[PDB]
Tab-separated table of C-alpha atoms in Angstrom:
chain	number	residue	atom	x	y	z
U	1	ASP	CA	35.342	-2.928	-10.003
U	2	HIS	CA	35.058	-6.715	-9.704
U	3	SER	CA	32.997	-5.884	-6.787
U	4	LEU	CA	30.486	-4.022	-8.506
U	5	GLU	CA	30.199	-6.962	-11.329
U	6	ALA	CA	29.740	-9.508	-8.621
U	7	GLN	CA	27.151	-7.739	-6.955
U	8	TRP	CA	25.257	-7.347	-10.072
U	9	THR	CA	25.646	-10.815	-11.034
U	10	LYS	CA	24.347	-12.103	-7.572
U	11	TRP	CA	21.366	-9.408	-7.773
U	12	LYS	CA	20.425	-10.905	-11.206
U	13	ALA	CA	20.449	-14.662	-9.625
U	14	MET	CA	18.682	-13.987	-6.552
U	15	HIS	CA	15.855	-12.354	-8.528
U	16	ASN	CA	16.178	-14.949	-11.381
U	17	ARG	CA	16.886	-12.243	-14.060
U	18	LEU	CA	17.570	-13.186	-17.447
U	19	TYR	CA	17.918	-10.325	-19.962
U	20	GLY	CA	18.365	-10.258	-23.750
U	21	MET	CA	21.999	-9.032	-24.932
U	22	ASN	CA	20.703	-5.279	-25.439
U	23	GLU	CA	18.170	-5.166	-22.399
U	24	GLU	CA	21.112	-6.338	-19.927
U	25	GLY	CA	22.822	-3.321	-20.730
U	26	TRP	CA	20.197	-0.785	-19.947
U	27	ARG	CA	19.065	-2.732	-17.026
U	28	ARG	CA	22.202	-2.645	-15.493
U	29	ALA	CA	22.623	1.163	-15.814
U	30	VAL	CA	18.941	1.560	-13.989
U	31	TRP	CA	20.147	-1.005	-11.248
U	32	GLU	CA	23.560	1.163	-10.946
U	33	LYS	CA	21.899	4.289	-10.544
U	34	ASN	CA	19.557	3.133	-7.725
U	35	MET	CA	22.646	1.598	-6.013
U	36	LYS	CA	24.070	4.959	-6.093
U	37	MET	CA	21.339	6.764	-4.695
U	38	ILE	CA	20.836	4.248	-1.789
U	39	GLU	CA	24.458	4.671	-0.940
U	40	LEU	CA	24.305	8.338	-0.769
U	41	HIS	CA	20.950	8.356	0.855
U	42	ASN	CA	22.107	6.001	3.685
U	43	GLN	CA	25.598	7.931	4.399
U	44	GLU	CA	23.067	11.017	4.581
U	45	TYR	CA	21.122	8.840	7.266
U	46	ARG	CA	24.078	8.089	9.352
U	47	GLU	CA	24.723	11.714	9.165
U	48	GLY	CA	21.297	12.517	10.569
U	49	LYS	CA	19.820	13.910	7.591
U	50	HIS	CA	17.282	11.102	7.351
U	51	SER	CA	14.982	9.403	9.365
U	52	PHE	CA	14.715	6.107	7.070
U	53	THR	CA	17.089	4.034	5.427
U	54	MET	CA	17.092	2.685	1.425
U	55	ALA	CA	18.158	-1.297	0.420
U	56	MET	CA	17.979	-2.617	-2.922
U	57	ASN	CA	15.138	-5.103	-3.461
U	58	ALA	CA	13.257	-7.231	-6.470
U	59	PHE	CA	12.279	-3.410	-8.089
U	60	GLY	CA	16.094	-2.642	-8.487
U	61	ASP	CA	15.587	-2.832	-12.214
U	62	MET	CA	12.269	-1.343	-12.970
U	63	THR	CA	11.779	1.241	-14.855
U	64	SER	CA	9.464	4.384	-13.851
U	65	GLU	CA	7.197	3.394	-16.856
U	66	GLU	CA	6.957	0.225	-15.616
U	67	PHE	CA	6.537	1.458	-12.092
U	68	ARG	CA	3.286	3.113	-12.962
U	69	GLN	CA	2.153	0.225	-14.737
U	70	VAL	CA	2.145	-2.729	-12.243
U	71	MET	CA	3.251	-1.141	-8.754
U	72	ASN	CA	0.164	1.338	-8.193
U	73	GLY	CA	-3.588	1.212	-9.227
U	74	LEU	CA	-5.255	4.504	-8.356
U	75	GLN	CA	-7.507	6.213	-10.438
U	76	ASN	CA	-7.079	10.189	-11.161
U	77	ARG	CA	-10.746	11.213	-10.396
U	78	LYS	CA	-11.159	10.433	-6.571
U	79	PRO	CA	-15.076	10.923	-5.774
U	80	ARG	CA	-16.473	11.455	-2.610
U	81	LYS	CA	-19.927	9.646	-2.779
U	82	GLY	CA	-19.898	7.507	0.715
U	83	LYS	CA	-21.412	8.442	3.894
U	84	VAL	CA	-19.760	11.116	6.152
U	85	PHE	CA	-17.785	10.530	9.081
U	86	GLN	CA	-17.938	13.622	11.725
U	87	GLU	CA	-14.783	13.928	13.634
U	88	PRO	CA	-15.643	13.293	17.372
U	89	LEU	CA	-14.611	16.200	19.541
U	90	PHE	CA	-15.315	14.903	22.827
U	91	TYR	CA	-13.144	11.801	22.149
U	92	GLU	CA	-9.666	11.566	22.953
U	93	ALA	CA	-7.646	9.032	20.866
U	94	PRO	CA	-4.657	7.175	22.639
U	95	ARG	CA	-1.190	8.137	21.729
U	96	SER	CA	-0.705	4.769	19.761
U	97	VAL	CA	-2.825	2.089	18.084
U	98	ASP	CA	-1.717	-0.974	16.321
U	99	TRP	CA	-4.628	-3.316	15.140
U	100	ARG	CA	-2.052	-6.049	14.167
U	101	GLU	CA	-2.032	-6.672	17.827
U	102	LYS	CA	-5.738	-7.179	18.092
U	103	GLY	CA	-5.539	-9.615	15.352
U	104	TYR	CA	-7.392	-7.508	12.607
U	105	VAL	CA	-4.832	-7.609	10.085
U	106	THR	CA	-4.258	-10.605	7.619
U	107	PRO	CA	-0.449	-11.442	6.348
U	108	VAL	CA	0.924	-9.021	3.625
U	109	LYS	CA	-0.008	-9.758	0.321
U	110	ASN	CA	1.692	-9.103	-3.225
U	111	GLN	CA	-0.219	-7.634	-6.122
U	112	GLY	CA	2.117	-8.678	-8.503
U	113	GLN	CA	2.218	-7.424	-12.271
U	114	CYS	CA	-1.109	-6.047	-11.605
U	115	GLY	CA	-1.896	-2.279	-10.920
U	116	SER	CA	-4.530	-3.127	-8.294
U	117	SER	CA	-3.456	-1.746	-5.175
U	118	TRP	CA	-6.879	-0.475	-4.818
U	119	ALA	CA	-8.192	-4.307	-4.378
U	120	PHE	CA	-5.600	-5.031	-1.848
U	121	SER	CA	-6.451	-1.619	0.205
U	122	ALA	CA	-10.314	-2.372	-0.020
U	123	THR	CA	-10.073	-6.078	1.351
U	124	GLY	CA	-7.816	-5.034	3.829
U	125	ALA	CA	-10.110	-2.798	5.601
U	126	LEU	CA	-12.676	-5.366	5.000
U	127	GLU	CA	-10.862	-8.064	6.667
U	128	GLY	CA	-10.596	-5.724	9.676
U	129	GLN	CA	-14.383	-4.663	9.777
U	130	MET	CA	-15.269	-8.711	9.486
U	131	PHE	CA	-13.137	-9.523	12.248
U	132	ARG	CA	-14.459	-6.587	14.379
U	133	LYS	CA	-18.042	-8.206	13.686
U	134	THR	CA	-17.056	-11.722	14.013
U	135	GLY	CA	-13.958	-12.060	15.750
U	136	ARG	CA	-12.781	-14.325	12.898
U	137	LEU	CA	-10.003	-13.352	10.351
U	138	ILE	CA	-10.745	-14.505	6.811
U	139	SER	CA	-8.704	-13.341	4.149
U	140	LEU	CA	-10.690	-11.965	1.324
U	141	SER	CA	-10.253	-12.198	-2.442
U	142	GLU	CA	-8.795	-9.226	-4.282
U	143	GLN	CA	-9.335	-11.319	-7.826
U	144	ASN	CA	-12.983	-11.125	-6.905
U	145	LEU	CA	-12.835	-7.252	-7.216
U	146	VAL	CA	-10.574	-7.146	-10.134
U	147	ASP	CA	-12.805	-9.574	-12.127
U	148	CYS	CA	-16.394	-8.384	-11.188
U	149	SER	CA	-16.165	-4.743	-9.866
U	150	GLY	CA	-16.020	-3.262	-13.646
U	151	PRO	CA	-19.671	-1.919	-13.970
U	152	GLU	CA	-18.547	0.314	-10.286
U	153	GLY	CA	-15.802	2.172	-12.372
U	154	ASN	CA	-12.834	-0.237	-11.942
U	155	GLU	CA	-10.720	-1.308	-14.385
U	156	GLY	CA	-8.783	-4.608	-13.003
U	157	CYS	CA	-5.015	-4.219	-13.420
U	158	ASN	CA	-5.515	-0.659	-14.921
U	159	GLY	CA	-6.338	0.989	-11.639
U	160	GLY	CA	-9.470	1.547	-9.644
U	161	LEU	CA	-10.703	2.970	-6.083
U	162	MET	CA	-11.387	1.431	-2.865
U	163	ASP	CA	-14.718	3.189	-2.934
U	164	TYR	CA	-15.718	1.705	-6.180
U	165	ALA	CA	-14.469	-1.753	-4.565
U	166	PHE	CA	-17.082	-1.057	-1.422
U	167	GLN	CA	-19.665	0.039	-3.654
U	168	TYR	CA	-19.411	-3.468	-5.668
U	169	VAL	CA	-19.497	-5.300	-2.520
U	170	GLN	CA	-22.934	-3.452	-1.552
U	171	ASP	CA	-24.221	-4.072	-5.110
U	172	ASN	CA	-23.223	-7.461	-5.224
U	173	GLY	CA	-24.143	-8.532	-1.658
U	174	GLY	CA	-20.898	-10.257	-0.809
U	175	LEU	CA	-17.100	-10.605	-1.497
U	176	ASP	CA	-15.754	-14.269	-1.611
U	177	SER	CA	-12.806	-15.398	0.632
U	178	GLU	CA	-9.313	-15.554	-1.070
U	179	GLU	CA	-9.652	-19.404	-0.620
U	180	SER	CA	-12.349	-19.760	-2.807
U	181	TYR	CA	-11.166	-16.985	-5.373
U	182	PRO	CA	-7.446	-17.136	-5.484
U	183	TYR	CA	-5.172	-14.276	-6.955
U	184	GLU	CA	-3.868	-14.476	-10.617
U	185	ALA	CA	-2.755	-10.985	-10.748
U	186	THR	CA	-4.514	-10.651	-14.453
U	187	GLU	CA	-8.341	-9.897	-15.543
U	188	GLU	CA	-10.439	-12.920	-15.998
U	189	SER	CA	-14.027	-13.853	-15.827
U	190	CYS	CA	-16.065	-12.903	-12.838
U	191	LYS	CA	-16.370	-16.359	-10.842
U	192	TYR	CA	-18.098	-14.756	-7.760
U	193	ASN	CA	-19.937	-17.682	-6.053
U	194	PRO	CA	-22.372	-16.818	-3.204
U	195	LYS	CA	-21.291	-20.147	-1.295
U	196	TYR	CA	-18.164	-18.578	-0.087
U	197	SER	CA	-19.814	-15.056	0.438
U	198	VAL	CA	-18.798	-12.575	3.452
U	199	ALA	CA	-19.939	-9.287	4.099
U	200	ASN	CA	-23.493	-9.204	3.181
U	201	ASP	CA	-24.748	-5.799	4.236
U	202	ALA	CA	-22.102	-3.397	3.571
U	203	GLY	CA	-21.384	0.298	2.978
U	204	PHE	CA	-18.706	2.580	3.123
U	205	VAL	CA	-17.854	5.965	4.799
U	206	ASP	CA	-15.430	8.838	3.545
U	207	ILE	CA	-13.130	10.477	6.018
U	208	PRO	CA	-12.852	14.526	6.171
U	209	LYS	CA	-9.382	15.461	4.656
U	210	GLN	CA	-7.559	15.856	8.109
U	211	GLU	CA	-4.931	13.817	9.928
U	212	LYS	CA	-6.624	14.818	13.109
U	213	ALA	CA	-9.891	13.234	11.743
U	214	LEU	CA	-7.918	10.252	10.401
U	215	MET	CA	-6.457	9.373	13.555
U	216	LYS	CA	-9.579	9.471	15.654
U	217	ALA	CA	-11.080	7.155	12.837
U	218	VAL	CA	-8.185	4.542	12.896
U	219	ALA	CA	-8.673	4.360	16.763
U	220	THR	CA	-12.338	4.061	16.885
U	221	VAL	CA	-13.033	1.664	13.516
U	222	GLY	CA	-10.063	-0.189	12.829
U	223	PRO	CA	-7.789	-0.371	9.854
U	224	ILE	CA	-8.386	2.543	7.254
U	225	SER	CA	-7.813	2.461	3.673
U	226	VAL	CA	-5.789	5.285	2.312
U	227	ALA	CA	-4.155	6.750	-0.863
U	228	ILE	CA	-0.609	7.709	-0.984
U	229	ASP	CA	1.744	9.421	-3.199
U	230	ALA	CA	4.122	6.348	-3.750
U	231	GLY	CA	6.267	7.299	-6.952
U	232	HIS	CA	9.552	7.822	-5.457
U	233	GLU	CA	12.458	5.794	-5.429
U	234	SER	CA	12.610	6.589	-1.719
U	235	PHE	CA	9.367	4.735	-1.161
U	236	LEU	CA	10.454	2.076	-3.524
U	237	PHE	CA	13.525	1.164	-1.678
U	238	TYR	CA	12.136	1.901	1.657
U	239	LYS	CA	13.921	-0.177	4.509
U	240	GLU	CA	12.966	1.028	8.073
U	241	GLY	CA	12.385	4.089	9.939
U	242	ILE	CA	10.229	6.859	9.586
U	243	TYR	CA	9.668	7.767	6.017
U	244	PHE	CA	9.628	11.145	4.863
U	245	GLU	CA	9.694	12.579	1.151
U	246	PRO	CA	10.314	16.395	0.486
U	247	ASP	CA	8.814	15.589	-2.708
U	248	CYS	CA	5.964	13.838	-1.703
U	249	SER	CA	2.541	15.197	-3.133
U	250	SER	CA	-0.473	15.564	-1.066
U	251	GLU	CA	-3.107	15.710	-3.837
U	252	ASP	CA	-1.645	13.215	-6.295
U	253	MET	CA	-1.982	9.964	-4.916
U	254	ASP	CA	-1.209	6.899	-7.089
U	255	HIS	CA	-1.258	4.111	-4.566
U	256	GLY	CA	-3.745	2.429	-2.575
U	257	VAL	CA	-2.612	1.035	0.811
U	258	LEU	CA	-4.032	0.356	4.188
U	259	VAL	CA	-3.458	2.217	7.606
U	260	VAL	CA	-2.969	-0.386	10.721
U	261	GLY	CA	-2.357	2.043	13.389
U	262	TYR	CA	-0.389	5.070	14.470
U	263	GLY	CA	2.290	5.642	17.070
U	264	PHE	CA	5.691	7.829	17.956
U	265	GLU	CA	8.892	6.783	18.424
U	266	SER	CA	10.091	6.753	22.047
U	272	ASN	CA	8.624	11.149	15.687
U	273	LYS	CA	5.084	10.517	15.114
U	274	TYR	CA	4.065	7.964	12.227
U	275	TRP	CA	1.333	5.813	10.944
U	276	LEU	CA	1.584	2.142	10.429
U	277	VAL	CA	1.056	1.094	6.948
U	278	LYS	CA	0.606	-2.127	5.022
U	279	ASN	CA	1.628	-2.308	1.719
U	280	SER	CA	1.087	-5.138	-1.083
U	281	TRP	CA	4.393	-5.510	-2.529
U	282	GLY	CA	5.158	-8.829	-0.247
U	283	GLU	CA	6.989	-9.046	2.887
U	284	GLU	CA	10.426	-8.260	1.186
U	285	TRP	CA	9.734	-4.603	0.834
U	286	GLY	CA	10.370	-2.403	3.980
U	287	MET	CA	9.610	-3.752	7.188
U	288	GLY	CA	8.106	-6.946	6.422
U	289	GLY	CA	5.797	-5.246	4.299
U	290	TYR	CA	5.305	-2.589	6.412
U	291	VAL	CA	6.233	1.270	6.494
U	292	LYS	CA	6.170	3.995	9.351
U	293	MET	CA	4.970	6.959	7.559
U	294	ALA	CA	5.395	10.770	8.654
U	295	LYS	CA	2.173	11.768	10.699
U	296	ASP	CA	1.096	15.174	11.539
U	297	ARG	CA	3.640	16.844	8.868
U	298	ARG	CA	1.072	18.599	6.685
U	299	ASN	CA	-0.809	15.599	5.154
U	300	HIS	CA	2.420	13.833	4.018
U	301	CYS	CA	2.159	12.037	0.836
U	302	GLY	CA	-1.683	12.759	0.660
U	303	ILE	CA	-2.413	9.952	3.475
U	304	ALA	CA	-5.390	11.858	4.844
U	305	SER	CA	-6.750	13.151	1.539
U	306	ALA	CA	-8.648	10.114	0.049
U	307	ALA	CA	-9.317	7.665	3.259
U	308	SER	CA	-12.368	5.711	3.798
U	309	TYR	CA	-13.545	2.209	5.323
U	310	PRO	CA	-16.748	-0.145	4.677
U	311	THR	CA	-19.320	-0.632	6.954
U	312	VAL	CA	-20.696	-4.393	7.978
């Protein structure tokens, strides 16, 4: 009715959308299907069938093809070439951890029209380690990785891996700050300048494919880089609460993110920092189901750098 037409017009304006005559038609269809599922889902939430709610956002008119192109960023083959993390049995991890309260985490960033989640997950873990080492929080450059880690196996906006990113930092002897090497969301020439370098003696460690191990690692090291299966509109439109997708895969992770802590609702979850801006989820964060048989592959390809 008039309400639907009005809401569509408002969303378009709000997100500054200008479509051609033919596109307008199918973009709206995409948007309406999403609005319908968000509605049905939220009703089921009220009925207690879900732990999280959904809400329309800037990705309301996006196609699955476009999603795979700019929202993700992880490569198919995920090799384990880093040092090994041995789960300490005689260490008892706390019930909850949140590194943002310790000042290990920088503000939420936005990868934009570039499938570079690998770069954001990488700098995220590095920023925490540098803070653990200097007590100084400096935002690192994702653009540096995008433009320079090609030899390490990365493909800029076409995907890469966090380990390849950590490898680059090793071989290179440093990574610039975001202030000196701004994010452009595209592949340009490598402008790495030593004058603004940080993390000169790096390396990386891979964590076993177990949540118990991942938990002990987060509690003792700081934020950790993890890969998750994010290809679901439930995640795309996630709003708040504990995210749980029955159709989530524990083996096909396409999105790189950062775990900054874990806890339980006073029911356990992982505090995850995403790079889709503050307008997504909980200020750019998502509480993901913990200890639910490696939900979304959270513990299948986790690692952290060493400085």
